[PDB]
């Protein structure tokens, strides 16, 4: 029963670098291997087959070798374009099996988020909730800090977050944490904030505004 | 040009069953073999189905081989997998994908290969769950000249995944940001779509979210003003 073991899991790198990774065989399978690339939001996508013939639309960058037991996806020119995840596969017989992936992205100049802060909705508040937003728009690295304050009192664990893949376009992130709140603690409070750390920052910069202005 | 798109997918409890479809568009149909391919939230790509591109499901995985059964009609340009006996296990994102290897010619019956899937479709969520579908609240995330304002809705308690959002009716397009849903205590997920317009158009232009939560049939249209 054959076994497909990738690696690395996940990979980073800057654009224009050579990036590896490999597919390892439990047994030799000659040259029945395919790789696959998940493009963020989309479906697989077949790159190299016959281990190192690539699909009619693959660019240059890409290029396969190795055989019977180890394989080797390569790009040797990295773009912004080819961040997603990169899977091997086995085919010709079932049960067709998948190495567990291998998640690639970006290192590029450091970018300050654009932050933003929003009040809950009035249909909400009459829903008995509210629910205050803060936004980090367009940032790297993913490494951010989100501090929430209600009346400069630190708030934690009683907000979610939610972070973009990276986007192709600029090669940042972009985030969005949820403070939610019943209406009633939330009317017994005035200022909300939310207060960002990020490497591109010099110093934390607060978003905040003061509820019924 | 060559497309495969997939139908079925929503909440189906443990034990019971759906039944998926796979519709083609844009190749000969007749000669190629057809897969069934899932996605688990944590989980690798995992094949599931294969049916020949005549009348032979050569394979189904270990773990489906009496609960799944796929099917095909050349006729129609269909392929389906029914799926009884659902589990926990079985919940992920299902793919209808076409097989590489073509067909050529007969001399002795045909041959059968699988050069292992080239083509894939947008793919289909399953989730089975003892819990119930709820359609989601969309609220307005308003702004309040000069500089770059951003606008937003907000997709909250909804189940199950996914729902998509469109901002003016699939016109806009630049700057959205739409973020992966996040899962409540409650157990019900939550959704915000974003987007950065430059301010100056806040007082001219009209900015729409468009809510889309097919399990629950929810189509809700959203207008966002500061």
């Known amino acids: 029963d054959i076994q497909m073991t990738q690696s690395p899991s996940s990979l980073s790198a800057s654009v224009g670098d050579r990036v590896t990774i490999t597919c390892q065989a439990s047994?030799?399978?000659?040259?029945?291997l395919n790789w696959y690339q998940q493009k963020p939001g989309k479906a697989p996508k077949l790159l190299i087959y016959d281990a190192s013939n690539l699909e009619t639309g693959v660019p240059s960058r890409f290029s396969g070798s190795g055989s019977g037991t180890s394989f080797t996806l390569t790009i040797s020119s990295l773009q912004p374009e080819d961040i997603g995840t990169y899977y091997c596969?086995?085919?010709?017989?079932?049960?067709?099996?998948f190495g567990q992936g291998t998640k690639l992205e970006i290192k590029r100049t450091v970018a300050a988020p654009s932050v933003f802060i929003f009040p809950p909705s009035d249909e909400q508040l009459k829903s008995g909730t509210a629910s205050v937003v803060c936004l980090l728009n367009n940032f790297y690295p993913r490494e951010a800090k989100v501090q929430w304050k209600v009346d400069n009192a630190l708030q934690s664990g009683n907000s979610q977050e939610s972070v973009t893949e990276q986007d192709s376009k600029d090669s940042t992130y972009s985030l969005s944490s949820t403070l939610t709140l019943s209406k009633a603690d939330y009317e017994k409070h005035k200022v909300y904030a939310c207060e960002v750390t990020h490497q591109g920052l010099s110093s934390p910069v607060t978003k905040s505004f003061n509820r019924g202005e | 040009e060559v497309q495969l798109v997939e139908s079925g997918g929503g909440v189906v409890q443990p034990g019971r069953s759906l039944r998926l479809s796979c519709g083609v568009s844009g190749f000969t149909f007749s000669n190629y073999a057809i897969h069934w391919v899932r996605q688990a939230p944590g989980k690798r790509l995992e094949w599931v189905a294969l049916?020949?591109?005549?009348?032979?499901?050569?394979y189904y995985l270990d773990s489906v081989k009496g609960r799944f059964t796929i099917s095909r009609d050349n006729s129609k340009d269909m392929v389906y997998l029914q799926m009884n006996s659902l589990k926990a296990e079985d919940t992920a994102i299902y793919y209808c994908?076409?097989?590489?290897?073509?067909?050529?010619?007969?001399?002795?019956?045909?041959?059968?290969?699988?050069?292992?899937?080239?083509?894939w479709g947008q793919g289909t969520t399953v989730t089975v769950s003892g819990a119930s579908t709820k359609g989601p609240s969309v609220f307005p995330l308003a702004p309040s000249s000069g500089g770059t304002a951003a606008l937003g809705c907000l997709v909250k308690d909804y189940f199950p995944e996914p729902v998509t959002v469109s901002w003016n009716s699939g016109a806009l397009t630049s700057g959205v940001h739409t973020f992966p849903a996040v899962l409540q205590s409650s157990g019900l997920y939550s959704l915000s779509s974003v987007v950065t317009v430059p301010s100056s158009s806040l007082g001219t232009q009209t900015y729409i979210c468009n809510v889309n939560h097919k399990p629950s049939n929810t189509k809700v249209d959203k207008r966002v003003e500061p």
């Open positions: 596969q086995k085919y010709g017989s079932v049960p067709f099996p």
């Open positions: 047994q030799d399978i000659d040259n029945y």
């Open positions: 994908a076409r097989d590489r290897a073509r067909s050529t010619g007969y001399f002795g019956g045909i041959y059968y290969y699988y050069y292992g899937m080239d083509v």
């Open positions: 049916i020949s591109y005549d009348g032979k499901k050569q």
